[PDB]
């Protein structure tokens, strides 16, 4: 871990997105995928009419799946982004025709340090499905592992990507969060019996353009 | 000091108005509250 | 922020942790000397009344805050409604002294008598609790005594109060999720 | 208009110890001169320090006499200004008018036997919390002084103020069975032909003796 | 803990009182209650006759109680101080009428790191008894917690307190050590079955005045 | 002086408030107490 | 200010006589009345 008994030291990381914070005492750092900053947000396709909506840049949550001893190598859970959102970010998709944002992603798999096994968490662009042999190369994508003896949290941050500078999220999902079982979960005598996997995600640098009419 | 609000001097000497304190030879809770940790214990992101 | 909870070191986080802004506070009303400096009524004995702040009922503002301290010091003012003349004697006086008027005696003047009295105990401070008999406080914990033909009302007022070593201060235990009461409000 | 004022309730009644003065009615009186009159005293404790007065022992006498027993206690009494032994002293007469005191009280012992009578005495102060010593050997562990007779007939000893509180009461409460301030124990270590001789005892205020909180407590 | 596997780092503290020492490898620091030094030891009530007795300033020991799984929140053990002492400090109470001293207190509750639950240890002035509701505010007094996952030792240091500058310990006890169960002890499969609680206490700045006669 | 404690000047002249003392042409007990012997009369050891 | 007319200082401190105002971080009708047009809008003859 490179730090120092229980989950600790410079392994304590607090992330803040808007008026929401998340702290973990077993951080293994943050993986920045493909870039450490967004490319230009004001290009010719929006004619200077885009605006940033800071109120949407905050954490929202979802359950992913329950990791059990019967899952074997290659078992995956895929979550396309953006996903259903019932807060401010979600209302933006019904109010503007074009949008772009990156993602700050935290995935946790809380069991205890007596469990064994390993999960690979990755952010993959343009992914609807993947073949079994391709899973052996999932590390080509921005990723981090969750290995119970070391950590319970994975954190990946990625920018907006796409053939277009702004997107129409109702018809295209640029990113897919994938969690894959690398080595099966072991419980032994003292480990947690199963591990529920959850995601805490925040949209970043949210820009919108093209206001829609109301339904009224 | 206290719940007193006259601007003019007391008609009676201090020696009569109150008992007089003496010294031999300090607000503990104020120091304790001021000493409180108000930071963040690990690394901060964003 | 996270911290080692086993330590008694105080931790006081602020709203800045998630982007807020801490405001200015004005705490004059919770200053000890100010809050204790007001009259509180006690039920008097007919004639001889020992001046003892522990007579202030524990649910009153003054009585509860006094009991939230272990040791205290203060001078005192009393306001008394009485028939006849009122005599006061200092801490340590034989009870018979209360009949001798060379001891401070205020002649009756309607509607009441108000007096400023000095602390007279032989101790550097007094205490609201004392672990001797393990209820009863030593006899020397008092501000003297007063006597009149009849004492019908007695109010105490702590002056220059000082408090040391805080003790529990309890609100009402409610039966429901919130203790609700009728608050003053413009009528119907 | 004129100056408005609030005549305040609770103020103005006559108080027997008030700090103000009455209005005068008969002026311009010049007194006969009295400067330099002898014997003035301005503080009662100056008198109490400078003029020791006699203690009172069994039989109504100001002395104890040499004993010829195995019993070496000459006198043992409560260190109290309300003690019978101190009851005829100026110190006790003054103390009855105050509720508290602090500081040193001095005892003086004057031998009055003939030239051929010799003796050795011991005074000890026994603090409260344990019964007072019955023998010079047990009392040796207390603060104490021993002295013998000779050319100088008087010995003076300071009883120290030791207490939990900074002041003690001058009066003694009906509930206190044993004296709260301890005891003064006077012993005879031994004597050489001093049978029947008198040791006169007096008391005076020490340098830091202090009385505070005037009180008028007598009914008669 | 703020330090670094097993009980360690700047969590190793050695306390010395006279010719006695006590070392713990899971210290959480020392709580100083009400002051970090004594007030004046020579006032008018002892007329300059008081003396310090350094030979009494050393550790003495007592068992407090056995913490078991059936104890519930609020279960307390009270120890008035001074308590019976058969060494030098105890003999001082039979030799002098007046005394004062502070206390250096160490309380240990040794189980293992697989036990759960929590004890609150506090030094409370003038305490003969306390009501159930008042226990919720025991933290107003100098205290420290003992939480098995973190530590086995609590350490509190307090000065002499009282309405009087010197005391008569045969009739008044200014301090009471209280240990209270905050969360019940859990044993699970690997914890110690019960935890015996012990105190290691040293009188500090011991002054005496007013020598007594002997019984002889 | 005495048991008086007002800080403000008496409204009446001194000539009326009290009798006036005169002089012709001194605290004996204070001097007597101050003169007291407080030493030790012979040799002191240890 | 108001209907008050004593020339001598209040015996009580301001902190007791009235509530104290605070500031964060202006007579609109006076400005509005002062801004009124009082001229003549076209040409004037004789």
Across D20-112, the runs of DSSP E, i.e. the strands, are 53-54, 63-65, 73-78, 98-102, 105-111
Q: Among A161, A188, A185, A192, which Cα is nearest to A175's?
A: A161
* Contact criterion met (CB < 8 Å) for E29 and C167: no
Domain boundaries, chain D: 1-220
The SS3 call for residue D35 is: coil
Taking the CA atoms of residue C182, residue C183, residue C186 and residue C187 in that order, the dihedral angle to the nearest 10 degrees is: 10
Residue pairs between chains C and D whose CB atoms are closer than 8 Å: 84
Task: CATH number of the domain at B4, please.
Answer: 4.10.90.10
Please provide the DSSP assignment of E129-193 as one string: ---TGGGGGGGGSSEEEE-TTT-SEEEEEE----SSSSB-TTT---EEEEEEEEEEEE-TTTS-S
Q: Nearest to residue D28, comparing CAs of E190, F14, C85?
A: F14
Bridge partner residues of A16 (DSSP): A21
C-chain CB neighbours of A12 within 8 Å are 2
Question: What does DSSP assign to residue A49?
Answer: -
D1-220 domain in CATH 2.60.120.20?
Answer: yes
Please answer yes or no on whether E161 and C167 come within 8 Å at the CB atom.
no
The CB density around residue C143, as the number of other CB atoms within 10 Å, is 24
What residues are paired with A147 via a beta bridge? none
SS3 per-residue string spanning C58-80: CCCHHHHHHHCEEEEEEEEEEEE
Cα end-to-end distance, chain E, whole Å: 56
Question: Cα–Cα distance between E203 and C22 in angstroms, integer?
Answer: 44
Cα radius of gyration rounded to whole Å, chain C: 22
- C157-to-C38, C63, C80 alpha-carbon distances in Å: 5, 11, 12
Asked whether the beta carbons of residue D215 and residue C97 sit closer than 8 angstroms, the reply is yes
- Show which of residues 177-196 on chain E sit within 8 Å of chain A, judged by CB atoms: 189-190
User: Hey, are the CB atoms on C9 and B39 less than 8 Å from each other?
Assistant: no
- DSSP 8-state assignment for residue F6: B
C17 interfacial to chain A (CB closer than 8 Å)? yes
Expt. technique = X-ray
What letter does residue D30 receive in the DSSP assignment?
Answer: B
Say if D86 is an interface residue toward chain E (CB within 8 Å).
no
The DSSP result for G1-46, as a single string, is --S----SPPSB-HHHHSPPP------HHHHHHHT---S-SS----
DSSP assignment string, chain C: ----TTS---B---GGGGT--------GGG-HHHHH-S-EEEPPPSS-EE--GGGS-TTSHHHHHHHTEEEEEEEEEEEEEEES-EEEE-TT--GGGGG-TTSSEEPP-TT-EEEEE----SSSSEES---S------TT-S--EEE-SEEEEEEEEEEEEEEEEE--------SSSS---PPP----
Minimum-distance CB partner of B46 among A15, A23, A27: A15
Chains A/B: 3 or more C-beta pairs closer than 8 A? yes
In angstroms, the separation between the Cα of residue F22 and the nearest Cα of chain D is 5
Helix (H, G, I), strand (E, B) or coil at D95: helix
Neighbours of chain E (3+ CB pairs under 8 A): A, B, C, D
C104 touching chain D per CB within 8 A: yes
Q: Give yes or no for A214 touching E (CB within 8 A).
A: no
Angstrom distance (rounded) from CA C145 to CA C99 = 12
Residues 6+ apart with CB under 8 A from G15: B5
**Angle, vertex CA D112, rays to CA D108 and CA D113, nearest 5:** 140
Q: Which residues of C4-30 are buried (b: 16+ CB within 10 A; e: fewer)?
A: bebbbbeeeeeeebeeeeeeeeeeeee
Tally: H helices and E strands in chain A: 1, 12
Q: Could you tell me the residue range of the domain that residue G9 belongs to?
A: 1-46
- Strands E143-146 and A143-146, by their bridges, are unpaired
CB contact under 8 A, A16 and C18: yes
DSSP state of A190: T
Nearest CA in chain D to B19: D213
Total of domains in chain F? 1
**Please, which residues 1-46 of chain G have a Cβ atom closer than 8 Å to chain B?**
9-13, 15-16
How far is residue F7's CA from residue A23's CA, in Å, rounded to a whole number?
66
Cβ <8 Å between C105 and D16: yes
Chains F and G touch (3+ CB pairs under 8 A): no
Rg (CA), chain G: 22
CATH of C1-188, picked from 2.60.120.20, 3.40.50.300, 3.40.630.10, 3.90.420.10, is 2.60.120.20
Those residues with Cβ within 8 angstroms of residue D34's Cβ, 6 or more apart along the chain or in another chain: F21
Cis omega (within 30 of 0) on the bond before G38?
no
| DSSP element (H, E) containing D93 | helix D90-95
A167 φ/ψ angles, rounded to the nearest 5 degrees: -120, 170
What is d(CA E101, CA E167) in angstroms, rounded to the nearest whole number?
9
User: Which chain E residues have a beta carbon less than 8 Å from that of C168?
Assistant: 133-134, 136-137, 140
Closest residue to D42, CB basis, from F27, F32, F36: F27
Fold classification of E1-216 (topology level): Jelly Rolls (2.60.120)
Residues E43, E95: contact at Cβ < 8 Å?
no
Question: What would the two tokens of residue C10 be?
Answer: 């105080």
Residue F45 Cα, gap to closest chain D Cα (Å)? 14
Spacing of C-alpha D143 from chain mean position = 19
User: Residues of D with CB below 8 A from B13's CB?
Assistant: 19
Q: What is the gyration radius of the CA atoms in chain F, in angstroms?
A: 22
Domain ranges of chain A: 1-216
Number of Cβ atoms within 10 Å of the Cβ of A158: 24
Q: How far apart are the first and last CA of chain B?
A: 47
| Backbone dihedral angles phi then psi of residue E75, each to the nearest 5 degrees | -65, 130
- Encode burial over E108-121: b for 16+ CB neighbours within 10 A, e otherwise: bbebebebbbbbbb
Chain breaks in chain D (C to N over 2.5 A) after: none
Q: Edge-to-edge strands of the sheet including C105-106?
A: C49-50, C145-147, C86-89, C105-106
- Strands lying side by side in the sheet with A116-125: A76-81, A175-186, A116-125, A143-146
Greatest C-alpha distance within chain G: 64
A213 contacts: CB under 8 Å, gap ≥ 6: none
Q: Which residues of B touch D19 (CB under 8 A)?
A: 12-13, 16
Residue E124 CA: distances (Å) to CA of C163, E80, E157, E189, E212? 16, 9, 12, 36, 30
Number of Cβ within 10 Å of residue C83's Cβ equals 11
Nearest to D172 by CA among C93, C45, A207: C93
Q: Which class for E10: exposed (0-12), middle (13-18), buried (19 or more C-beta within 10 A)?
A: exposed
Residue of E nearest to A10 (CA): E4
F9 vs D18, E114, E163, F12, F13, CA distance in Å? 17, 80, 41, 9, 10
Q: How far is CA F13 from CA D28, D31, F23, in A?
A: 10, 17, 20
- CA closest to C158 among chain B residues: B2
Q: How many CA atoms lie within 13 A of E5 on its CB side?
A: 1
Q: Which residues contact G12 (CB under 8 A, 6 or more apart)?
A: B5, B6, B7
Residue entry with tokens 């970090």: E36
In the complex, which subunits touch G with 3 or more CB pairs below 8 angstroms? Answer: B
DSSP H or E stretch at residue E21: strand E20-24
Contacts of A163 by beta carbon, 8 Å cutoff, 6+ apart: none
Compute the nearest-CA separation of B19 from chain D (Å).
12
Cα–Cα distance measured from residue E184 to residue E179, given in angstroms and rounded to the nearest whole number: 13
- Residue D47, SS3? helix
Matching residue, tokens 């295209």? A172
Q: Looking at chain C from residue 30 to 59, which residues have their Cβ under 8 Å from any Cβ of chain A?
A: none
Nearest to E99 by CA among E57, E149, E150, E141: E57
Beta strand E153-158 with E31-32 is parallel
**DSSP bridge partners of A107:** A154, A199
Option in B19, B35, B38 nearest C118 (CB): B19
Question: For the residues of F14-39, what is the DSSP string, one character each?
Answer: HHHHSPBP------HHHHHHHT---S
Residues before each break in chain F (C–N > 2.5 Å)? 25
Q: Which residues in chain D have Cβ-Cβ distances shorter than 8 Å to F16? A: 24, 27-28
* C-alpha span between A156 and A125 (Å, rounded): 13
Instruction: For residue A106, count CB atoms less than 10 angstroms from its CB and return exposed for 0-12, middle for 13-18, buried for 19 or more.
Output: buried
CB–CB of G15/B5 below 8 Å? yes
DSSP B1-46: --S--B-SPPSB-HHHHSPPP------HHHHHHHT-B-S-SSEEE-
- For B24, the closest chain C residue by CA position comes to C124
Task: Tell me the C-alpha distance between E79 and D64, whole Å.
Answer: 50
Token pair of E179, please? 């240990």
* Annotated resolution, angstroms: 1.9
Q: Cβ–Cβ of B41/E40 closer than 8 Å?
A: no
- Could you tell me the two tokens for C23? 């405001």
CB E214 within 8 A of CB E94: no
Name the nearest CA neighbour of A158 among A172, A144, A168. A144
Residue D158: enclosing H or E segment and its boundaries? strand D154-159
Contact check, Cβ <8 Å, C104/D168: no
**Of the candidates E28, E147, E174, which has its C-beta nearest C131's C-beta?**
E174
Interface test with D, best of E207, E210, E215 (most D CBs within 10 A): E210
Q: What is the DSSP string of A123-152?
A: EEET-S---TGGGGGGGGSSEEEE-TTT-S
Separation between Cα atoms, residue D42 and residue F31, nearest integer Å: 11
Interface probe with F: pick from D16, D17, D21, most Cβ of F within 10 Å: D21
Buried (b) or exposed (e) across G5-44, using 16+ Cβ within 10 A?
eeeeeeeeeeeeeeeeeeeeeeeeeeeeeeeeeeeeeeee
Contact E177, E79 (CB under 8 A): yes
Task: With CB atoms and an 8 Å threshold, state whether C19 touches A18.
Answer: yes
Who among E2, E35, E40 is closest to B25 (CB)?
A: E40
């Amino acid at each position: 871990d490179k730090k120092t008994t229980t989950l600790l030291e410079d392994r304590i990381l607090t992330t803040r997105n808007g008026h929401t914070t998340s702290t973990t005492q077993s951080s293994v750092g943050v993986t920045y995928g493909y870039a450490t900053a967004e490319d230009f947000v004001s290009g010719p396709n929006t004619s200077g009419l885009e605006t940033r909506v800071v109120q949407a840049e905050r954490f929202f949550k979802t359950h992913l799946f329950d990791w059990v001893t019967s899952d074997s190598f290659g078992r995956c859970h895929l979550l396309e982004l953006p996903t259903d959102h019932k807060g401010v970010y979600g209302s933006l998709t019904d109010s503007y025709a074009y949008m772009r944002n990156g993602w700050d992603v935290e995935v946790t798999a809380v069991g205890n340090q007596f469990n064994g096994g390993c999960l690979l968490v990755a952010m993959v662009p343009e992914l609807c499905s993947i073949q079994k042999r391709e899973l052996y190369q999932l590390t080509l994508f921005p990723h981090q592992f969750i290995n119970p003896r070391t950590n319970m949290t994975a954190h990946i941050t990625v920018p907006f990507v796409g053939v277009n500078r702004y997107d129409q999220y109702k018809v295209h999902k640029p990113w897919t969060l994938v969690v894959m079982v690398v080595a099966p979960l072991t419980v032994n005598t003292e480990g947690a019996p199963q591990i529920k996997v959850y995601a805490n995600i925040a949209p970043t640098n949210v820009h919108v353009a093209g206001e829609f009419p109301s339904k009224e | 000091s206290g719940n007193t609000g006259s601007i003019i001097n007391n008609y009676y000497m201090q020696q009569y108005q109150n008992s007089m304190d003496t010294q031999l030879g300090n607000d503990w809770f104020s120091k304790l509250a001021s000493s409180a940790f108000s930071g963040l214990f690990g690394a901060l992101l964003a | 922020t996270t911290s080692a909870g086993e330590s008694a070191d105080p931790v006081t986080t602020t709203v800045e942790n998630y982007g807020g802004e801490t405001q200015i506070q004005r705490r004059q009303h919770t200053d000890v000397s100010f809050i204790m400096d007001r009259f509180v009524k006690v039920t008097p004995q007919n004639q001889i009344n020992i001046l003892d702040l522990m007579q202030v009922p524990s649910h009153t503002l003054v009585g509860a805050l006094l009991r939230a301290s272990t040791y205290y010091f203060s001078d005192l003012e009393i306001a008394v409604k009485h028939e006849g003349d009122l005599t006061w004697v200092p801490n340590g006086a034989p009870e018979k002294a209360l009949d001798n008027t060379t001891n401070p005696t205020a002649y009756h003047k309607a509607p009441l008598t108000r007096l400023a009295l000095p602390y007279t105990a032989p101790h550097r401070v007094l205490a609201t609790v004392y672990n001797g008999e393990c209820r009863t406080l030593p006899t020397s914990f008092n501000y003297g005594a007063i006597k009149a033909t009849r004492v019908t009302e007695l109010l105490y007022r702590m002056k220059r109060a000082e408090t040391y070593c805080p003790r529990p201060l309890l609100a009402i235990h409610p039966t429901e999720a919130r203790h609700k009461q009728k608050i003053v409000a413009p009528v119907k | 208009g004129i100056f408005p004022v609030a005549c305040s309730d609770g103020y103005g009644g006559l108080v027997t110890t008030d700090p103000k003065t009455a209005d005068p009615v008969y002026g311009k009186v010049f007194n006969p001169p009295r400067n330099q009159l002898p014997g003035r005293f301005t503080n009662l404790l100056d008198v109490a320090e400078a003029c020791p007065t006699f203690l009172r022992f069994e039989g109504g006498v100001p002395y104890v006499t040499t004993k010829t027993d195995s019993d070496r206690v000459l006198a043992q009494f409560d260190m109290s200004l309300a003690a019978k032994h101190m009851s005829n002293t100026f110190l006790a007469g003054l103390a009855q008018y105050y509720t508290q005191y602090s500081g040193t009280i001095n005892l003086h012992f004057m031998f009055t036997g003939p030239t051929d009578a010799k003796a050795r005495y011991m005074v000890a102060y026994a603090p409260p919390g344990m019964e007072p010593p019955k023998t010079p050997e047990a009392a040796a562990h207390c603060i104490h002084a021993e002295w013998d007779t000779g050319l100088n007939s008087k010995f003076t000893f300071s009883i120290p103020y030791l207490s939990a509180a900074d002041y003690t009461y001058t009066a003694s409460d009906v509930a206190e069975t044993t004296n709260v301030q301890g005891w003064v124990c006077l012993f005879q270590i031994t004597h050489g032909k001093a049978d029947g001789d008198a040791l006169v005892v007096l008391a005076s205020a020490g340098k830091d003796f202090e009385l505070r909180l005037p009180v008028d407590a007598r009914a008669e």
